Design a protein around this motif. Sequence first.
Motif, short mmCIF file in Angstrom:
data_model
loop_
_atom_site.label_atom_id
_atom_site.label_comp_id
_atom_site.label_asym_id
_atom_site.label_seq_id
_atom_site.Cartn_x
_atom_site.Cartn_y
_atom_site.Cartn_z
N UNK A 34 0.85 -1.18 0.00
CA UNK A 34 0.00 0.00 0.00
C UNK A 34 0.89 1.24 0.00
N UNK A 35 0.56 2.19 -0.85
CA UNK A 35 1.37 3.39 -1.04
C UNK A 35 0.93 4.48 -0.07
N UNK A 36 1.91 5.24 0.41
CA UNK A 36 1.71 6.30 1.38
C UNK A 36 2.34 7.57 0.82
N UNK A 37 1.70 8.71 1.01
CA UNK A 37 2.24 9.96 0.46
C UNK A 37 3.45 10.45 1.24
N UNK A 38 4.24 11.30 0.58
CA UNK A 38 5.34 12.00 1.23
C UNK A 38 5.91 13.08 0.33
N UNK A 43 10.39 14.15 -6.54
CA UNK A 43 9.30 13.67 -7.38
C UNK A 43 9.69 12.49 -8.26
N UNK A 44 10.97 12.13 -8.30
CA UNK A 44 11.42 10.99 -9.09
C UNK A 44 11.86 9.80 -8.24
N UNK A 45 11.62 9.83 -6.93
CA UNK A 45 12.11 8.78 -6.05
C UNK A 45 10.94 7.99 -5.48
N UNK A 46 11.27 6.88 -4.82
CA UNK A 46 10.27 6.05 -4.15
C UNK A 46 10.79 5.65 -2.78
N UNK A 47 10.00 5.91 -1.74
CA UNK A 47 10.41 5.59 -0.38
C UNK A 47 10.24 4.13 -0.05
#
Length: 51
Positions: A34-38, A43-47
């Motif tokens: 499940x994806x969570x905002x941050x 804007x080109x990365x993924x946590x």
Amino acid sequence: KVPIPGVKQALEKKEGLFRKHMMGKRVNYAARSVISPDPNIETNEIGVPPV
DNA sequence: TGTCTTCAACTGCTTTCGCATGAAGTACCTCCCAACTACTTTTCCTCACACTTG
């Protein structure tokens, strides 16, 4: 009455061995979550969670 | 002799991706099993009659 499938049934329809295991497959080195905002990441990365 | 036309039966599909959580068929048959009761089983125990006596 629900006769065991033969190779013709094994290869076709929705599955079509071709469709369920050839045109698309499961893959290793993959995760689902499940994806969570941050807003603080680029804007080109993924946590990625440390798990 | 040769070519043409319609209808009805047959073929193949019509969201994707995952959790759950897997369960459940069953006729015909049964030999095995659990049961209640009675009957049977193995070792042991103890007394008893007749002939003869005097």
